[PDB]
Amino acid sequence: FKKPPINNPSDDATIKLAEAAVSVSDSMLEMAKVEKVITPPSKDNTLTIPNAYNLQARASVDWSGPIEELTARIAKAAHFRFRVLGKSPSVPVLISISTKDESLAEILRDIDYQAGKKASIHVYPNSQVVELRYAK
Amino acid sequence: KFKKPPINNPSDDATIKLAEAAVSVSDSMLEMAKVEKVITPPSKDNTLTIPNAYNLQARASVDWSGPIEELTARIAKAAHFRFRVLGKSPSVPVLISISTKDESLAEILRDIDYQAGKKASIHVYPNSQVVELRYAKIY
Amino acid sequence: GDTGSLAGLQAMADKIREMALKETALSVGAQAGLAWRAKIIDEQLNKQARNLDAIYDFNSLVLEHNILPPVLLEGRNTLNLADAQSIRISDRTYKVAKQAHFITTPPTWRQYLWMDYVKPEAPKAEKEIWCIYTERGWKNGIDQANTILEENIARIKEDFGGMILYRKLLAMNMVSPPYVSHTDLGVTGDGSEIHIDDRVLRITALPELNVNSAEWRAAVAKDENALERFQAKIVITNKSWQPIIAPVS
Amino acid sequence: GCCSKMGGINYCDSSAGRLVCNNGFYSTCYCTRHAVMDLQFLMGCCLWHGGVYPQLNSSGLVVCNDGYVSEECSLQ
Amino acid sequence: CDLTKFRWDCDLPVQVKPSPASSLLVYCGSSYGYITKQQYDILARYQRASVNMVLDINGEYIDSPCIGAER
Amino acid sequence: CDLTKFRWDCDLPVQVKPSPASSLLVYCGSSYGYITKQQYDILARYQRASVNMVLDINGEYIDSPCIGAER
Amino acid sequence: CFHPPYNNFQPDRRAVKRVGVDTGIGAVAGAIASGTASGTLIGAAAGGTVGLVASIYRDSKRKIIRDLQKQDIQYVEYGDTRTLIIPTDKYFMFSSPRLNEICYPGLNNVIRLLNFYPQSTIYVAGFTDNVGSRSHKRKLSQAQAETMMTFLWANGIAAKRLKAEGYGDKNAISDNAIIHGSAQNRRIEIQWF
Amino acid sequence: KLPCRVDGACDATIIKMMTDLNKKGIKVASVGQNYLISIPASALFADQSPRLNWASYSLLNEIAAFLKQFRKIAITVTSYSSKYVSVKRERALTLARSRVVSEYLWSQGVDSRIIFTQGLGSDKPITSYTLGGDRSPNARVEITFRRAV
Amino acid sequence: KLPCRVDGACDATIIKMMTDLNKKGIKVASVGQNYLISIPASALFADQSPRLNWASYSLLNEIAAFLKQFRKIAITVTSYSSKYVSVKRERALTLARSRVVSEYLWSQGVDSRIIFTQGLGSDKPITSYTLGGDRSPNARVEITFRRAV
């Protein structure tokens, strides 16, 4: 024999409380839907996984410091060459990657994302080079 | 005899006061939602960033009141999607509280993204089977 | 023998002397009743804890930099009779009860609605009207606990409603958003201690109601009619549900 | 006892806060105060206000550590 | 309409655009249409009799209350 | 693969180089290879069924977990 | 003899079951009293008659309405327009169109009462309180009313005889500003001629 | 020190008087807070005339007691009758009947801020059986109100 | 002054309920902290339909009590069935069955933050004996979870 929900609102006031809670959650969700600004995948200014075989190798990184050092080390581990285009800023661009099992492509993706608009990372797989492009 | 249909269980004045306050709060919520939608209607749906796919149509009834990352990781694991995180997790946690019942994992991820808002954003790449939570570039 | 129930309180004992008995019975009854009603109020709040979390979701109202939005209080049709021959009227007054500040955790409903509970241990005109007056004290304590809970509900409603009102006014450009600046130090420290990515966040401008009424933005909602919609058998049909008690005014 | 209809209490696993019975099954019983308990009803005055301010009372007022006066605990 | 019988059942077609023939406003909830003078008169008679006049489209209820508006 | 029978036993050859025909990544533990579109689809089906798909070379187990990656 | 969930929408047999049991007990009593075939036949006839009168009582419209009132359903007859008011709080899962099948005695009694009027036109109207949004109340009341109409149609009522319409907080039989009035406003009305 | 109930009203009294009026033939129904008292016009008035019999004043007294048992803001007295001469004829007849019943009920002071009155003649019958005059089922006076709080 | 065990759960009760479910035919196995309850679909649903019998609700009640005896973060309800019409047919049927069982278990409130649901149709059988419909051994509902601490 089927039993009613143990948490069923069976009070004249509890039912109203539960519908008010439902309405408040619905209104909050609608507010968040209006507020949220999204970037469509076509217009996303972020590094896409370079698909390079040497870059797909898994790694383990615990680094918190300048972007240049970690990017150069990642490139050398991937066996790609490394180059920097631009002038290094006075205050260094500091990043932090703490991962135990993540491929070098994804690590470079995270490095680019944390760099934001101060610097960007491009990967040329045909001529295997990681380029760190600073911004002025 | 004379009766009217809804003869419920006894109610307490504590619950009654909470119910009145909740109804007033819901009315204020409705008014602010309406005025803000009129002021600026939304233009983009997050189903672009979280496109549904097979095995993202598995369903789940969630009741969660903790940080976003653990819930998103559990959702991705149940969806057989590898979980990836971008950005530095802020010192102040991105707390989320999802209390749903029997809706698909794509819908739950969409709800999580909407609740996170300007703090965090969830993306799903179904070609690579990757659920990616990225913490915004604030700070 | 039990102080946690009116039955046990009464079973504990199963003009000057009369008045003293009345006063002491009321005093013992009031505290026990207030404690028991606070316990029941807490039990109800814990029963509805998740719904209360959904309703008073202070976390969703938190601004960009983990800043609690200010509390805005609104009044309409304001009038003040200063004296004979002088009144001051205003259509609406908006006030900032509490200003925006940096937070590290969103507020919860327990800080407002929780009622403190401790089981209070304590002990013809001698134990005959004592039960009557301790029942009266029990009812008084129940009423006092209900009043305290009502005030707590009012306080949480004021705070949540003020935050929602701030969001609404910011939508209509009747308040300014809080302006925050980050000073981005590099690696800061000396040989004894270093900090890698040192950043200092500072609210350089608190939100405030703007008096430039020209900059406000009115918002007008609408309801959808049959416009741009319509075999298209648009009909006003009598055949439908008709109320039993039809002309009620 | 606690591990009833099992073998009996093997040992308290302080890392988890629970007892471990004579089979591989854990026990529902806690063995340390740091076990994860679903504590939701907590007694005491001035919860969510810093606790009772430790002062010698001159009146029946119970003042919390943030200045708020716990009306539901004060004497009447 | 047939106004007495027992169930007072009847049908009022609604024209959306304000035609010169049918230019009398009717507010069916939030959805408003236009009807003729005789139709407005019989609708007002039904309103006096306090009869629900829900707007049905293709046999589907859309909006409950009908109240006459400016002619 | 034979996906139902009783033991769902089957075989997926792996090509180490990203050929134009087989260019879909599979991460067998830390050792990653490349397979085709149909092979990726059936591997994803087995992952949905929650079946261990350890990588075996010459009958020797090398790395247990297989998860599909970028196509 | 009877499947608890709606009896598979199949015809119900309380009358035949009760008369069968009554003839059984009457025949047993007659056989005990006499020990003869004629006495057993007399006892079986007595059981048949007592079962007939008992079922005539228990299948009456008045008894069905009394049972619906023992359940939390109200019946109103003004002239020849009969209305059943069924509270969604008891006969629906909370804020969902899902029927509350734990209350199957009430729904079966509703169907039995509606079966007494094979020619009536049934209007099923859904109502909610003031809590929530206008669109939400409209949609929820419509969904609940349609679920009730579908239940009626599945239990053996033609599709043409049924119309389902859902009002929000529009037509209130009680004050929404008070708890019990708001509760009374949550209902489904089934009107027929 | 404070009243324990609305003065002069009892739940047992309300139930007893509802039962008694229903037994007599005056239909007293209550859907939600809304109350309806449907009175056959043959039990109040004469044959298609707005003149009450002296005997009907006891019935009006019981109905006045029932109305006094509740607290309310507005009652409504509506009249319907079978078609006798013309539309204007039954409209005027029903308006007069509502006026007279409302005047008596108002004089027997009830807790009602407003007592609206109307007669629609033969606009809204409740029964297809229109045969008869004032004995017709759909020739009646409705007293509808809502209990206030 | 502090609870001595998780509320409403006993080791004797857990053992007795595992024994009873296994005697009935619901396989309750526990490898490590991982628990599995395998329910034959013939004891829950009708013939290849997502409609539980009213009698099966007692079985669902004992399973809900067993789930309530533990503390957990996520349960998983999976459905498998024999091949009847088409891959999409069995897939939809199994998803619906998992949805319904999980809805009932959620209503009978269990200490479970998440209750995942899935139906793979006829993807992973546990027996080579595929003859039969819902009586087939590999037509079942799996409720798998891990005890939390």
Per the rule left: phi > 0, alpha: psi between -120 and 50, beta: everything else, I120 is: alpha
Q: Say whether the G–D interface has 3 or more Cβ pairs within 8 Å.
A: no
Q: Which residues of I touch G3 (CB under 8 A)?
A: 54
What is each CA distance from G160 to C178, E52, I138, in whole angstroms? 61, 21, 45
Closest by Cα among B99, A25, A18, B4 to G131: A18
* Residue A134 backbone phi and psi in degrees, to 5: -75, 165
User: Could you tell me the sign of the dihedral formed by the alpha carbons of B68, B74, B75, B77, in that order?
Assistant: positive
Is the separation of the CB atoms in A24 and B25 below 8 Å? yes
Q: Is H135 helix (H, G, I), strand (E, B) or coil?
A: coil
Q: C48 forms bridges with which residues in the sheet?
A: none
Contacts A–F by Cβ distance under 8 A: 13
State the Rg of chain G over Cα. Answer: 21
Q: Is D24 helix (H, G, I), strand (E, B) or coil?
A: coil
Taking CB atoms and an 8 Å limit, are C245 and H116 in contact across chains?
Answer: no
Q: Which helix (H) or strand (E) holds H105?
A: helix H87-107
Taking chain D, what is the end-to-end CA distance rounded to the nearest angstrom? Answer: 45
CA distance E43 to E69: 11
Edge-to-edge, what's the strand order for the sheet holding E66-68?
E31-35, E24-28, E66-68
What is each CA distance from C101 to C56, C65, C66, D68, H1, in whole angstroms? 19, 10, 9, 20, 50
* Residue G180 backbone phi and psi in degrees, to 5: -70, -35
Closest by Cα among H112, H99, H32, H122 to H66: H112
Q: Give the residue on G whose Cα is nearest the Cα of B34.
A: G133
CA distance G64 to G73: 11
Q: Say whether the C–I interface has 3 or more Cβ pairs within 8 Å.
A: no
Taking CB atoms and an 8 Å limit, are B60 and I114 in contact across chains?
Answer: yes
Long-range contacts of the stretch F37-40 (C-beta < 8 A, 24+)? F37/F71, F39/F12, F39/F13, F40/F68, F40/F71
CA distance B111 to B101: 13
**C-alpha angle B95-B98-B101 in degrees, rounded to nearest 5:** 165
Amino acid at G162: L
Amino acid at I20: D
Amino acid at B57: Q
Edge-to-edge, what's the strand order for the sheet holding H34-40?
H27-31, H34-40, H140-146, H74-80, H114-121
Taking CB atoms and an 8 Å limit, are I124 and F51 in contact across chains?
Answer: yes
Half-sphere exposure of C110 (CA within 13 A, CB side): 15
The token pair that represents D44 in the structure block = 């005491």
The token pair that represents H21 in the structure block = 């009026």
Amino acid at I63: I
| DSSP secondary structure letters along chain A | -----TT---BHHHHHHHHHHHHHHHHHHHHHHHH-----GGG--S------TGGG-EEEEEEEEEHHHHHHHHHHHHT-EEEEES---SS--EEEEEEEEEEHHHHHHHHHHHHTTSEEEEEETTTTEEEEEE--
Taking CB atoms and an 8 Å limit, are H32 and B2 in contact across chains?
Answer: no
CA torsion, points E26, E32, E35, E40, in degrees to nearest 10?
Answer: -10
The token pair that represents I4 in the structure block = 């001595």
Is the separation of the CB atoms in A46 and A106 below 8 Å? no
User: Chains that contact H by 3+ CB pairs under 8 Å?
Assistant: B, C, E, G
Say whether residue G166 is in contact with chain E using an 8 A CB cutoff. yes
Q: Is B131 helix (H, G, I), strand (E, B) or coil?
A: strand
Strands (E), chain B: 59-64, 82-86, 98-99, 103-104, 120-125, 130-135
CA distance A27 to A79: 53
Q: Is C235 helix (H, G, I), strand (E, B) or coil?
A: strand
To which residue do tokens 């929408």 refer?
G9
> What DSSP character marks residue B47?
T
CA distance C221 to H82: 48
Q: Which residues of F touch A101 (CB under 8 A)?
A: 30
Is the separation of the CB atoms in E27 and E67 below 8 Å? yes
Q: Say whether the B–C interface has 3 or more Cβ pairs within 8 Å.
A: yes
CA distance G32 to E32: 79
Q: Which residues of B touch I74 (CB under 8 A)?
A: 74, 78
> What DSSP character marks residue H82?
-
Q: After which residues is chain G broken (C to N over 2.5 A)?
A: none
Among E7, E54, E64, whose Cβ lies nearest the Cβ of G193? E7
Among C27, C110, C115, whose Cβ lies nearest the Cβ of D72? C115
Amino acid at G134: R
Taking CB atoms and an 8 Å limit, are B13 and C45 in contact across chains?
Answer: no
Closest by Cα among G112, G131, G114, G130 to G122: G114
Is the separation of the CB atoms in I90 and I81 below 8 Å? yes
| DSSP secondary structure letters along F14-71 | -BSS--SSS-EEEEETTEEEEE-HHHHHHHHHHHHHT----EEETTEEEE--EEE---
Q: Give the residue on I whose Cα is nearest the Cα of F5.
A: I128
* Residue C170 backbone phi and psi in degrees, to 5: -65, -35
CA distance B22 to C56: 9
Q: I38 forms bridges with which residues in the sheet?
A: I27, I142
Per the rule left: phi > 0, alpha: psi between -120 and 50, beta: everything else, A86 is: left
Q: At what angle do helices G134-154 and G104-114 cross, to 10 degrees?
A: 70
CA distance F68 to F26: 5
Q: Which residues of B touch I114 (CB under 8 A)?
A: 60-64, 74, 78
CA distance C72 to C167: 9
Q: Which helix (H) or strand (E) holds H141?
A: strand H140-146
Q: Give the residue on B whose Cα is nearest the Cα of I114.
A: B62
State the smallest CA–CA distance between residue I107 and chain B in angstroms: 10
Substitution target from G77, G173, G175, G185 for chain C, most C beta carbons within 10 A: G173
Q: How many CB atoms lie within 10 A of CB A26?
A: 18
Closest by Cα among I34, I148, I104, C121 to F50: I34
CA distance A74 to B137: 23
Q: Is I103 helix (H, G, I), strand (E, B) or coil?
A: helix
Find the DSSP H helices in I1-149. 11-24, 56-68, 87-107
CA distance E31 to E53: 13
User: Chains that contact D by 3+ CB pairs under 8 Å?
Assistant: C, I
Taking CB atoms and an 8 Å limit, are G80 and E64 in contact across chains?
Answer: no
Residues whose CB falls within 8 Å of the CB of residue I149, separated by 6 or more in sequence, listed in order:
D16, D17, D18, D26, D35, D36, I71
To which residue do tokens 């509808």 refer?
H144
Q: Say whether the A–B interface has 3 or more Cβ pairs within 8 Å.
A: yes
CA distance I130 to F5: 8
| DSSP secondary structure letters along F1-24 | ---SSSS-------BSS--SSS-E
Closest by Cα among C15, H14, C173 to B38: C173
State the smallest CA–CA distance between residue G165 and chain E in angstroms: 6
User: Chains that contact I by 3+ CB pairs under 8 Å?
Assistant: A, B, D, F, G
**Strands E31-35 and B59-64, how do they pair?**
unpaired
Closest by Cα among G184, G192, G193 to G86: G184
Is the separation of the CB atoms in F23 and F16 below 8 Å? no
| DSSP secondary structure letters along A64-86 | EEEHHHHHHHHHHHHT-EEEEES
Is the separation of the CB atoms in C167 and C30 below 8 Å? no
State the smallest CA–CA distance between residue E59 and chain C in angstroms: 8
What is each CA distance from I15 to I20, I26, I109, in whole angstroms? 9, 14, 21
Taking CB atoms and an 8 Å limit, are E33 and C234 in contact across chains?
Answer: yes
CA distance I37 to I24: 12
Taking chain C, what is the end-to-end CA distance rounded to the nearest angstrom? Answer: 56
CA distance B139 to C200: 9
| DSSP secondary structure letters along G125-158 | EEE--SSS-HHHHHHHHHHHHHHHHHHHHHTT--
Is the separation of the CB atoms in D7 and D19 below 8 Å? no
Closest by Cα among F43, F42, F64 to F54: F64
CA distance I28 to I140: 13
State the Rg of chain C over Cα. Answer: 29
CA distance C170 to B102: 36
User: How was this structure obtained?
Assistant: cryo-EM
To which residue do tokens 């020797």 refer?
F60
Residues whose CB falls within 8 Å of the CB of residue C113, separated by 6 or more in sequence, listed in order:
B18, C45, C52, C149, C152, C153, C156
Taking CB atoms and an 8 Å limit, are D43 and C119 in contact across chains?
Answer: yes
Amino acid at G189: E
Q: Which residues of F touch B54 (CB under 8 A)?
A: 48
What is each CA distance from C62 to A32, C105, C198, G117, I12, in whole angstroms? 12, 10, 24, 59, 48
Say whether residue B3 is in contact with chain H using an 8 A CB cutoff. no
CA distance I145 to I124: 18
Say whether residue G137 is in contact with chain B using an 8 A CB cutoff. no
**C-alpha angle C112-C114-C117 in degrees, rounded to nearest 5:** 145
What is each CA distance from B95 to B71, B114, F64, in whole angstroms? 10, 12, 34
Q: Give the residue on D whose Cα is nearest the Cα of I15.
A: D5
**Strands A81-85 and A129-134, how do they pair?**
parallel
| DSSP secondary structure letters along B15-37 | HHHHHHHHHHHHHHHHHHHHHHH
Taking CB atoms and an 8 Å limit, are G72 and B5 in contact across chains?
Answer: yes
Is the separation of the CB atoms in I27 and I37 below 8 Å? yes
* Residue I108 backbone phi and psi in degrees, to 5: -80, 80
Say whether residue G94 is in contact with chain C using an 8 A CB cutoff. no
CA distance I55 to I37: 19
Contacts E–G by Cβ distance under 8 A: 15
Closest by Cα among C161, C159, C199, C160 to C180: C199
Among A21, A32, A92, whose Cβ lies nearest the Cβ of C51? A21
State the Rg of chain D over Cα. Answer: 21
Per the rule left: phi > 0, alpha: psi between -120 and 50, beta: everything else, G7 is: left
Among I11, I33, I111, whose Cβ lies nearest the Cβ of D3? I11
The per-residue b/e assignment along B31-44, b for 16 or more CB within 10 angstroms, e otherwise, is ebbbbbbbbeeeee
Interface subset of B 6-35, CB within 8 angstroms of G: 6-8, 11, 16, 19, 23, 26, 30
The token pair that represents C196 in the structure block = 């890698």
To which residue do tokens 């043409």 refer?
G160
Q: Say whether the E–A interface has 3 or more Cβ pairs within 8 Å.
A: no
Burial class (CB in 10 A: 0-12, 13-18, 19+), I8: exposed
To which residue do tokens 């039904």 refer?
E46
Among G78, G124, G165, whose Cβ lies nearest the Cβ of C244? G78
State the Rg of chain B over Cα. Answer: 20
The per-residue b/e assignment along E8-30, b for 16 or more CB within 10 angstroms, e otherwise, is bebebebbbeeeeebbbebbbbe
Is the separation of the CB atoms in C115 and C42 below 8 Å? yes
Is the separation of the CB atoms in H57 and H102 below 8 Å? no
What is each CA distance from B129 to A65, F1, F26, F44, F71, in whole angstroms? 31, 21, 11, 9, 10
Report CA A33 to chain centroid distance, whole Å: 21
Name the maximum alpha-carbon separation found in chain A. 76
Taking CB atoms and an 8 Å limit, are A58 and F17 in contact across chains?
Answer: no
Closest by Cα among A109, A104, A115 to A67: A115
Q: Give the residue on D whose Cα is nearest the Cα of I33.
A: D25
What is each CA distance from C228 to C232, C233, E58, G19, in whole angstroms? 12, 15, 17, 63
Q: How many CB atoms lie within 10 A of CB C100?
A: 23
| DSSP secondary structure letters along G93-116 | -TTSS-B-GGGHHHHHHHHHHHTT
Amino acid at G40: T
* Residue I72 backbone phi and psi in degrees, to 5: -155, 165
Is the separation of the CB atoms in F45 and F35 below 8 Å? no
Q: Give the residue on F whose Cα is nearest the Cα of B78.
A: F48
Closest by Cα among F9, A10, I145, H31 to C245: H31
Taking CB atoms and an 8 Å limit, are I16 and D28 in contact across chains?
Answer: no
Q: Say whether the A–D interface has 3 or more Cβ pairs within 8 Å.
A: no
Taking chain H, what is the end-to-end CA distance rounded to the nearest angstrom? Answer: 22
Q: Is C146 helix (H, G, I), strand (E, B) or coil?
A: helix
Closest by Cα among C114, C115, C112, C101 to C157: C112
Taking CB atoms and an 8 Å limit, are F67 and B82 in contact across chains?
Answer: yes
The token pair that represents D46 in the structure block = 């001035």
Burial class (CB in 10 A: 0-12, 13-18, 19+), H58: exposed
